[PDB]
Amino acid sequence: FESPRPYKLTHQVVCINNINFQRKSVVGFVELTIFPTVANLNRIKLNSKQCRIYRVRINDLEAAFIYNDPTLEVCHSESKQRNLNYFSNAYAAAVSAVDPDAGNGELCIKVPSELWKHVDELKVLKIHINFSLDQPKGGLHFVVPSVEGSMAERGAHVFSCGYQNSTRFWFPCVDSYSELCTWKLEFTVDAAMVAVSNGDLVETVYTHDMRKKTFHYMLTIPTAASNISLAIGPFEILVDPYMHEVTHFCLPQLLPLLKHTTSYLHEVFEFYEEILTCRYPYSCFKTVFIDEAYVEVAAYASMSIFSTNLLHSAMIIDETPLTRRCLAQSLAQQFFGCFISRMSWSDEWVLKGISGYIYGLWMKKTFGVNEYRHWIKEELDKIVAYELKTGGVLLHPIFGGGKEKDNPASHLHFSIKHPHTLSWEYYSMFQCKAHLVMRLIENRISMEFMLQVFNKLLSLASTASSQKFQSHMWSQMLVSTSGFLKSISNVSGKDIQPLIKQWVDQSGVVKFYGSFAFNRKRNVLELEIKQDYTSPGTQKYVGPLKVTVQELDGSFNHTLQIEENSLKHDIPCHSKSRRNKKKKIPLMNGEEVDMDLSAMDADSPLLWIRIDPDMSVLRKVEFEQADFMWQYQLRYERDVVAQQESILALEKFPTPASRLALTDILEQEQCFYRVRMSACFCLAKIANSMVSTWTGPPAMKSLFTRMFCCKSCPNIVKTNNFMSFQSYFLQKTMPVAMALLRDVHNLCPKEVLTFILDLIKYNDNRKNKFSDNYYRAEMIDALANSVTPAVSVNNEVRTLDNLNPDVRLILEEITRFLNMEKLLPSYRHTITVSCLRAIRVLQKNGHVPSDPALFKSYAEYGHFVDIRIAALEAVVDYTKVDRSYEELQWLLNMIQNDPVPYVRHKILNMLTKNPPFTKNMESPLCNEALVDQLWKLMNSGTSHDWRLRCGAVDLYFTLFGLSRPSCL
Template structure:
């Protein structure tokens, strides 16, 4: 939301926060906060604006002596007021944007307005601080603070009581009064009084813990001397176990009592990541202490605050887990990187958030590259780029910084600069509280890619120097106490970051920032080429898909350098093309001469030389394969057209795993024996990266299926997936009996999980799984033995259940209305159900880590339902979706119910899901459920086009509208989720099912009166300067007209008639009107002539009724269409007139 320069006439230098009455059972707290404000000029100001939501404010005092009056005004409590009937998503977005601007701290606004009493005005002196003290309380808050309080029923509870704060970006206003802006930093003193058995963890250094005289309560005193913004202050209270890192005493970990052994295992990864960042950035950790708290029912996986990180307890694991280790280590690395760029160096405003997002994730990516390898890092970059491209092509381009348009110097010469694209989304982009959470997630990934692109342009060392300079300036500023003018160095902005790059490197990156930060979209290339034998060149043609078509949504025209790599017989040669037109053509000179059908060692880009069989290549061409943008230096999607033998060479011999995965996916379009052989060679290659080999598992299954469907014999070449699995994991004497599990070789472990799933996707000519596949999977269950394995096999068994689900094919004929029993099921279905039931029963007795087997079993049951083998019922999933089940189990069950709702449209399923959205205590579950419904909506209907669905009703519209309009006003993320769902179901305009709603004036419906002052948009704000209380907005509603009346048409007819009378030479009288009005005029005239003719006929036949007939002929100023007008009120039907539908 806007502002580079704050309009606030004072600066915050220090804040004291004291919470004394924290009660976890009653979910209440009592607090006091004191803000030390320093006026920045001699100008007098009378109003202090603070942010405060859902707090009950009792008293406000200035310097402990002067009690001040205050006014609470929160327009976000109810975005659209005065019984808004239109229910339009567009109007909601506009009203939501206006409401947030009225309380935006960067615009010197807020929910709490404090009037400085006249007797205290002498305290307002430039550079002399004064204090504002506020007494407040919170009772059962529904946002900002989450209480995990088990129900007290006399029985022992598994979950201990705990409390922690959370928020969607800047949401500290939900639990204490503050200036809730990332740009307003200050020092802090924090005091928290809790029960004797509890521990309070907050930001800063723990100064002391003082017990009360009765020893029943204790107070924790924290001091945060590093200037910190209010959104980066947090608190966690609970009966935590404390674990201090034995080698880095400044790092302290907190968890619930039963989880201490798991915490000790995970804690070593923090130490490892901290040391890595200190070495990489050349700077010590920015805080003198660091605390990590693992809580249950976390709002999001990672919540970073100043010297404090609140993480989900689900990241904890023991040494026997393999899969979770990668996830946890990467999450911990991201948590620490956010301490540098998010908590310590904060953003100037929302438009600069891409910098803190991108730099933190970039540093996390460097950790992955260091400890997991370059292949894993490049795979991670590839997945992020695919996610960004997919989102932008579906919804529109993402602008990282929409605050300013690109400069006209982006492209030299006659090429026009890109124009700022209008907002294509259904939500405003100028506030994090209005944008979709999915948009924020993809924006974070795009920001990471932009920072990496910057590294490729200025170099890794130069970029590290830029980061180091930012940290050095911020560290120096943080040491200057009460130097508010120096604290601006702790804020980062797009303009300041660009200047820092120029200062450190001497390179001007303004053009790059304009091209990729201020302009939305990505590049979309299609490349074709032919080899010219006479000139020994490759004639290349690049086409960019840009325009207004659906295929070009989210794309932009890229102009600049583009690298194309040719792998020739004599090595890899890179060519840099300058893209200046569309399509772009270029001739690339080859450095090699063709050698017909000769084996030779081919040098690769890594310097390695490999033997290749060149018999399959074109004898006239020295080109083995071609790649576009091999370094992923652009955000783009590439479609390369080259023959299948070149894809095969690229898959087998390229050393870049991104190129290998691209080749494997491309070869799925060429189902031949040679393709099958090439994929098989990579699959069995022990030197290949495990992600490439798992990709080949599924690629080989798809190619095999297409060969079988086409009736072609597979032949003896290549390997089958089943035989390869048995060769790796089968016993020596009997291959179908699997050896005891041994997961010491991690590559084989991931293959052992992927191969059964890929085998299960194989099909016969009749599109059913072969019988031997089912027997193979059954034997895997039967002979699975993990007794001598030091790792758990839970994820492996879950993959076997997933494989069972993949064997299911749609039934040929669905049995409708028949009773399903075990006898009516097929043998394969019965075997699957037996394995699923056995797994679920065993899980209840001996639950595995994170209940991964239960999750896989539920998905397998749903797949049986989806394909018609079981009746589509939700009863099984209801119990697994209730609160109290493990998080992953709940989400899996909810996803199954959402799928059933999409297919069966049952009202009870919709009611169940909406009840969870409205009342579930876990905010993360509510968020995930709504995102599922957005991805798989039960119906879709655009405005004016009914969906003819039984779920599409006015009651559902009102329920969803009530949720996003007022009921969830304290959870900005969930409110935006509901808004996305509302737009998905009904579009941006008024839902078509609201056909009985009263009609509105086309100009003033659902809008506040234009005569009212702009400061009173919501009709409840008190203007302190004028002393005027605004009246409620006036709305003109045509309530007395019949339902079929079109108000716009009525107004148009009357306006035409009045124009004809007042000005006979007007365009309306001469027929020079737009198509709509001239059509209405013609209809009006023809109906009038017709009525006159009928009246003349009647007057001739009935002369005795002549007087009555004459009385019917009214002057033209009257409404002949059957309506009489009254300037003092709405339009009403005229007496004795015909209906307007008959006249039009």
């Protein structure tokens, strides 16, 4: 109910002063107003790192000072137990001891006996701490362009990105969540550079009248400490006119990009207050764009600060989803970092659950309900893929208290009480399972009842906030899992605790071997299907559910399920649909018009099998039908889920020409965008099986012929095929699938190669007002998908033939596009990213030799994030395939030494995803000194961020995981 934490807190005043750009330091004093709880509270603990305190003071009395860092290395630096398990357990216990959720110590000021007698008299105190941040090595960021003479004034900015508990790294506090406080914030800033944090503009004139300004932001609204961040430097734009109080802060020469970017946000506010039945529960809302991003999502109190990658300036069409997608994320996680709050790390999952569900509801009534279901399919793809890679993602209410583990989910790391042990794969699937558990709450409880629940939560939050700090009656904003469950059961009490003990408290992905049997094939038994499941390693036995069957022309049959899963079950049978030449359309689904006796329609009243088409269960369903039923699903079905799962099932085995015909019929209608992308991939995989069975034409030429008429297109489609984004996505996708069309003689895509060359010839001027960039990028990706691995028979790598014959033309085109984007550049060098992927594929086919020096020169510092991340993916795969130890040493040294966090994040991420030095396959000899240097990089040099040593924990998961590394 209540927090197990003494020393309640009310007020805190920050005052940043003397912020430097040359020695790059910060000095400041912080002010805490504290009501202690119990007597003999002598060793009062706060917590921070990289903070040299100048002095501490309580009412003109400098007391004692304790400053420890057990977040650093093991207490013996040469602890020979250099394995995963001992380091994981010792680090979990050590950083739990860093956490003040016990009698612990990181910053323990000792109360003297005089002030102890004062605590015996009055438990009301004030804390004044003068301190100084150095050159910030994990707590702030000083983005400075390398000029330093004049453009350090105009062109640089100062901010703080970080994780949830990164407030420790910036200014000293408690465990930085779950301390409902109020703040006064004093900012010694430049006259041009504007400081952006929480609260309100409560005292701002040209302040202190000497040379600079000083900002007073007061946060009276009670939040936690894990919401404060200070962006200094950008320029003010009000993009108000619809709701009059939305403020934005961005760097100069980026301002009409904001004038296009911000709008449609008022619609998101309108829909969120249709959901919540309130107002926006603040004064105003702030947004800062910045050329760095620890997290792309990041959402704080009345303020969203994230990357200058999401502008999307009116011509750059393929961020039409992404921009307001990330804005919806940075409003939802905003709303649930503001008021509703966890009591512990194990109690969080409700928050990001309801936030992801709220921006999913936003994705419902803004764009693409079928794309919304496709996003749910991508969520299931992510969850099934990761929890078949690794174990489950469990949502604990249960602790390991009493030095206990209780962790079957400890295949790698600790998960119960602590954030900074987890991986971003685990964190992403935490959010993904939060999405789908909220969809299970949809599946058992009505949406209107959820609106009632959420209105009750925000009613208790807004009533408990903005008051005179009611003593002992103020922690109602801690709305964690237990009381939230009680509120749901008060609204509608059902079997939601079985839903918890299934999906919240048993982290398992469930496959489904629902074996199709065929009764009423003029049979004695009537329409029966067997249920079966067993697949251990990561399995789960889920019982009572329902099953959806569509008839030929008839009812949605729904059938119960049972536990003890060696089962046989029935169907609420259709009539005997006989004389079906007369029974043409007896109401299939409304007024849909379809006629085929082409199936096995002698004695078959069934068409399709389905288990929960609204996608309740974390599922991977495996079964078999007749192939005619699968192909008849792809002429029309009212589920994009059914369409793309039949697309996968018909990507596996078949090759008739009627499949190609029905695929081309499905691709020429108004059905869906990405269904046709994966259907062109069906055409690719099936025409790859047309080596000896080349019955049709060379495919997908007639699809460009019969669908696109500019001026009737005399054999060639050239100009101005836009303003219909169906054709935009389709022309973006299809030549990539055309480049896969291969029959095995030399795989011979020569007509397709020349056709793609002719398409690259025929680009448009400014008649298209749509910045023809991604079309070029995916055609270069089709050139990358022109993999020809079998040219170098003996030695043709090293400028022998000036290698021949079409590879040289592809080199000409990628040279042209690289130098055009060196001269033109149009939007982020995305063409250069596709070209570098093409150059790596050519290095993987032995045409351009395996040399990292181009990728080395594009992994340098002063480039864009995407260029650098593509070159780093390239050099990670280079270290995987080739035996380059020296570039791995440089890669680890740049993991140690660079100021950008996200490139380190993604180096570690896709170094874990694409590993060299593979466990129990050790030919390049990691045992020599690489185990030692990786152990050092886990211990030392990684006190900057938590996630970098989390990625290093992922590295030792991949590299020599549950054993000694076979050194000694």
